[PDB]
Amino acid sequence: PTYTPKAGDTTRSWYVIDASDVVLGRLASAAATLLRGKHKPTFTPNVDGGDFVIVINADKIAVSGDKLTKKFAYRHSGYPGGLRKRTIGELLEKHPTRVVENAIIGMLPHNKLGRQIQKKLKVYAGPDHPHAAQQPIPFEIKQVAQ
RNA sequence: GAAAGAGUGCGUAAUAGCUCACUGGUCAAGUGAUUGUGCGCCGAUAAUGUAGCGGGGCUCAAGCACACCGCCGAAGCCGC
Ligand SMILES: [Mg+2]
Ligand SMILES: [Mg+2]
Ligand SMILES: [Mg+2]
Numbered sequence: 001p002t003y004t005p006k007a008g009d010t011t012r013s014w015y016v017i018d019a020s021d022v023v024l025g026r027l028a029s030a031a032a033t034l035l036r037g038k039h040k041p042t043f044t045p046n047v048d049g050g051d052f053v054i055v056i057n058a059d060k061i062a063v064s065g066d067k068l069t070k071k072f073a074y075r076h077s078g079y080p081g082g083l084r085k086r087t088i089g090e091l092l093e094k095h096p097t098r099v100v101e102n103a104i105i106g107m108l109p110h111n112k113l114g115r116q117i118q119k120k121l122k123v124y125a126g127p128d129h130p131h132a133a134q135q136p137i138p139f140e141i142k143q144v145a146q
Numbered sequence: 147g148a149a150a151g152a153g154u155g156c157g158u159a160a161u162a163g164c165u166c167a168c169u170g171g172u173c174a175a176g177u178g179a180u181u182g183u184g185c186g187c188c189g190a191u192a193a194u195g196u197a198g199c200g201g202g203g204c205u206c207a208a209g210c211a212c213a214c215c216g217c218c219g220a221a222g223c224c225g226c
C-alpha cells in the first residue's frame with residue numbers, strides 16, 4: 001500500500017538561505033516550504049520530516065510598500081490594557097531576527113508537530129552562523145516554470 | 147488711442163496709496179477650459195485585546211479589468 005516512513009527513514013539536510021534584499025513573505029514562505037518537507041517525495045503529513053534551515057542576513061530583509069512604519073506586531077500581556085505594539089521598523093533594530101522568524105511561524109501549522117518543526121529554524125541577523133560543521137548548502141529562491 | 151474698468155482686491159472708515167483686468171517689450175513651445183469615463187483620496191467616528199483579509203504575509207501582487215492555458219475540488223457522474 002501507500003508508503004509510510006519507518007523508524008530510520010528520515011534524513012535531514014542543512015540549507016542556508018541568504019536574506020539580503022529578499023521579500024519577507026517570499027523568503028518566509030519558501031523557508032516554511034523546505035522546513036515542513038513539502039519538497040520531498042516521501043512527504044507524509046503525520047511525520048516531521050523536513051530539513052534544517054539557516055537564514056543568514058535577517059537584517060537585510062526587504063519589506064515592500066510602506067510597512068516599515070504602519071505595520072504592527074501586537075502582543076498582549078494578559079493584564080487589562082496589556083497590549084503593546086511594535087512596528088516592523090522598531091523590531092528591525094531592537095532585535096531583528098524574530099521579524100523574519102515571526103513570518104515563518106505564521107506559515108507553519110499551529111499544532112504540536114509545528115512546535116517540533118520550529119526547532120529546525122536558525123535565524124541569524126549577521127552574515128555568518130556557527131553551524132559550519134554541518135556543511136549547509138546554499139539555497140536559492142527558485143520558481144518552476146509552466 | 148494700445149493702455150485705462152461708471153474702475154478688479156487690500157486698505158485709506160470718504161479720498162490717497164498699494165495693485166489689478168487691459169497695449170509696448172528680451173524670453174522660447176506649447177498653454178488654458180470643459181465632457182465621458184477606469185481605478186484611487188478626504189468626510190470616517192466607542193468602550194476586555196490587534197479586532198471591517200480566517201492568519202502569516204502580499205504592491206518584486208499573493209490587488210483590479212480584459213483574453214487565454216492548466217490543474218485541485220463533493221457521498222454529483224463514470225470505472226469494478
Ligand atoms: Mg476707479
Ligand atoms: Mg503689472
Ligand atoms: Mg489573505
Ligand SMILES: [Mg+2]
Nearest residue numbers: 219220221222
Ligand atoms: Mg470523490
Ligand SMILES: [Mg+2]
Nearest residue numbers: 221222223224
Ligand atoms: Mg451516486
